[PDB]
Amino acid sequence: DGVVHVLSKNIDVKNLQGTFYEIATNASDKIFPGLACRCTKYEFSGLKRDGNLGYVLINFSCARNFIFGEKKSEMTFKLILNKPLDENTTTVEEFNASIYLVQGNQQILLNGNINIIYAELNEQNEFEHLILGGQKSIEPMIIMSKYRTVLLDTYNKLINSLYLAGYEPSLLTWPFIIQTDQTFC
Amino acid sequence: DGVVHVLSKNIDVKNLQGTFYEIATNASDKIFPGLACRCTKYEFSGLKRDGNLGYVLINFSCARNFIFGEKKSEMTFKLILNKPLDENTTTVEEFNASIYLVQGNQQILLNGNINIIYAELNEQNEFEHLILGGQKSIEPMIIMSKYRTVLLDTYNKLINSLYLAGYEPSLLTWPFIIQTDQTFC
Amino acid sequence: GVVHVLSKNIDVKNLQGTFYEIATNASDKIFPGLACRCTKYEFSGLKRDGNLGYVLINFSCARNFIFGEKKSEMTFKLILNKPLDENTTTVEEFNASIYLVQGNQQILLNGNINIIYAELNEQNEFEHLILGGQKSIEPMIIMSKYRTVLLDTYNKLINSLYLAGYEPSLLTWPFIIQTDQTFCD
Amino acid sequence: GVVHVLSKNIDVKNLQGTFYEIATNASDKIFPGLACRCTKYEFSGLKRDGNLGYVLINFSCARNFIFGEKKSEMTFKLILNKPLDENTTTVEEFNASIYLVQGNQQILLNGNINIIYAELNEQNEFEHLILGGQKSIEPMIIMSKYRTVLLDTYNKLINSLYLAGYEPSLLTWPFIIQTDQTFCD
Numbered sequence A, B: 001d002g003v004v005h006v007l008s009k010n011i012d013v014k015n016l017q018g019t020f021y022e023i024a025t026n027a028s029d030k031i032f033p034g035l036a037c038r039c040t041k042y043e044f045s046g047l048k049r050d051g052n053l054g055y056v057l058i059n060f061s062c063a064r065n066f067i068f069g070e071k072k073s074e075m076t077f078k079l080i081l082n083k084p085l086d087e088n089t090t091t092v093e094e095f096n097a098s099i100y101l102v103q104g105n106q107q108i109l110l111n112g113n114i115n116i117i118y119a120e121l122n123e124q125n126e127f128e129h130l131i132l133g134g135q136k137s138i139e140p141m142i143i144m145s146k147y148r149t150v151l152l153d154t155y156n157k158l159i160n161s162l163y164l165a166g167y168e169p170s171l172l173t174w175p176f177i178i179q180t181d182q183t184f185c
Numbered sequence C, D: 001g002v003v004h005v006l007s008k009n010i011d012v013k014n015l016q017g018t019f020y021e022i023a024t025n026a027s028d029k030i031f032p033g034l035a036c037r038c039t040k041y042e043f044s045g046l047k048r049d050g051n052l053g054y055v056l057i058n059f060s061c062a063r064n065f066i067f068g069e070k071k072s073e074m075t076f077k078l079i080l081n082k083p084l085d086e087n088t089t090t091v092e093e094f095n096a097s098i099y100l101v102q103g104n105q106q107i108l109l110n111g112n113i114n115i116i117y118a119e120l121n122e123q124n125e126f127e128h129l130i131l132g133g134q135k136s137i138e139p140m141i142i143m144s145k146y147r148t149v150l151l152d153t154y155n156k157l158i159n160s161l162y163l164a165g166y167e168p169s170l171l172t173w174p175f176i177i178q179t180d181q182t183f184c185d
């Protein structure tokens, strides 16, 4: 049972919009865009439609550190929902999508199964915290927040959220969970 | 002068065919595909014209290690030479090319200036060793070879090639140059 | 690249108790800090052998061996480099040699470790300690009365390093490492 | 997880002069081998304190501080754990304690280090040593008379680790680190 289930069902894809800050990731996420990033940032667009496709664009931006200086690094992704989405509703029982790399009209599938695992709604019915993950503990997982920092309490909840989702309790500390440096930026 | 120069001119693209093994890379090669890679390999397709335009396909494979085990990892790349190439000739003054990530009928540009900096021919007019790289020491650079491993004399020679080419001398040692593990493949 | 003390006229008496390691530079990982989580320092408070003053330090952490954690404990001695009359318990500048110690043996590690910056509170006890060398590249440690600190407090501590003469570009992720102070049962 | 010595009846007389470090597991880095290139152990050959067999080691490396390399130089003392008769020069197993030393001071670091494997050359000397604890995750070091070794030699040495009781999975990159022996004065 190293297999992780979604906690947060019934997600209004409409309020998957605006800026989130990478708080922390597992190792498997550094493999593509994360490596050597500081001040990592996801500007999710809003929900968009091409016929029966629900999808959100993501602008990824970081200060990538090349030791003898930092270059800004920008890339667009496209989260496409795997199941088609009826135009009467904006809500899905589970957010389960294919993340593509996007440049002009060309697109390349990176992962066929990315999930919102956990979402905290705040007073104004919006996303304060998001955990994105695959169906397995070793597949790329990202903790992002409406804010650059979260108090130790928040962080232990988000980590406990990963547990109840079914991450090995052993993979919830330093070597396997890496804090993104959000300091200057 | 700041810039990495091509040493190996008048290159017969016809013979950029077959497997080469990753010996060593700079840190910046890891930001994209090589992050946790053992046993890394590049199969070239040899020259392909689609008219006045010359290009080569690379199948990248590695045993990427997730700490709890290794999956295989397979991607395709497309080197499109920047100058056009006449149909009579199979040769170019310098190998200068844009590199694309490809998948099905999709291509995403990653870099407008990747070069063959140095190549070692044999009597049978074919590539023993290759160094690919950009114009600065901070763009990805790869040393690869006909052979899974190489004697120190050969490695000392390839690193020197990089010195002569204009690659900053203090960036030719460990933290900045990473030997690829080619044990057990 | 010379760093100077900010905090002068420091009362050594009240350098006792438990400080948690918040952040180190890469240099400090060379000796006892590599792969440490939950890193803690217990100070003895001022001890004298006549005009010679010193302080003892119980270093402890949970070292991560990727497949589990050993508790690792060591003792260090800070000997003040200048003598210290049996009148006062205050020094113009805390400047000391640090020793590894085990029973009555003691091996010198560094002849210049300083208290760069110290924050006192109403009861004249230390909220935060920055320990450092004379060069930015020598080992540097940020430790607190508290296991975690607010982005605010951390920014104040980094500002202090700046004014002490750490290169502003040495004060971000690759060269300043946050210690994992979570799940420390 | 339990390792047994393979090379028995070792002549400690001919544990002398200069070995170059080929490779290491993660655990050796924790003390001195961090950021070390060109790592080198000069053994003193067997010394006697009557009943006590012991060997000195001048450890030296080029330590990489990112912005330049200092020489790093330490002395160790290997005391054999069972007393050694002055008639014999040869132990059934080399099981010894390693101390850091500096002038007349010594501090125990590990009380159970073993020569697991010695390869004898025609002068009946050590071509190759493997040092190591009883446990796969204790510090292990593969060191050779030569700065490099042939893939065949490397595979033979890694094979010895398997026969001695290392998990097959801990014999590849993340856990076995090759030492950079490039650019070494």
Ligand code: NA
Residues within 6 Å of the ligand: B036, B037, B038, B178, B179, B180, B181, D173
């Ligand atoms: Na590698």
Ligand code: NA
Residues within 6 Å of the ligand: D097, D111
């Ligand atoms: Na002993």
Ligand code: NA
Residues within 6 Å of the ligand: B174, D035, D036, D037, D178, D179, D180
């Ligand atoms: Na190394």
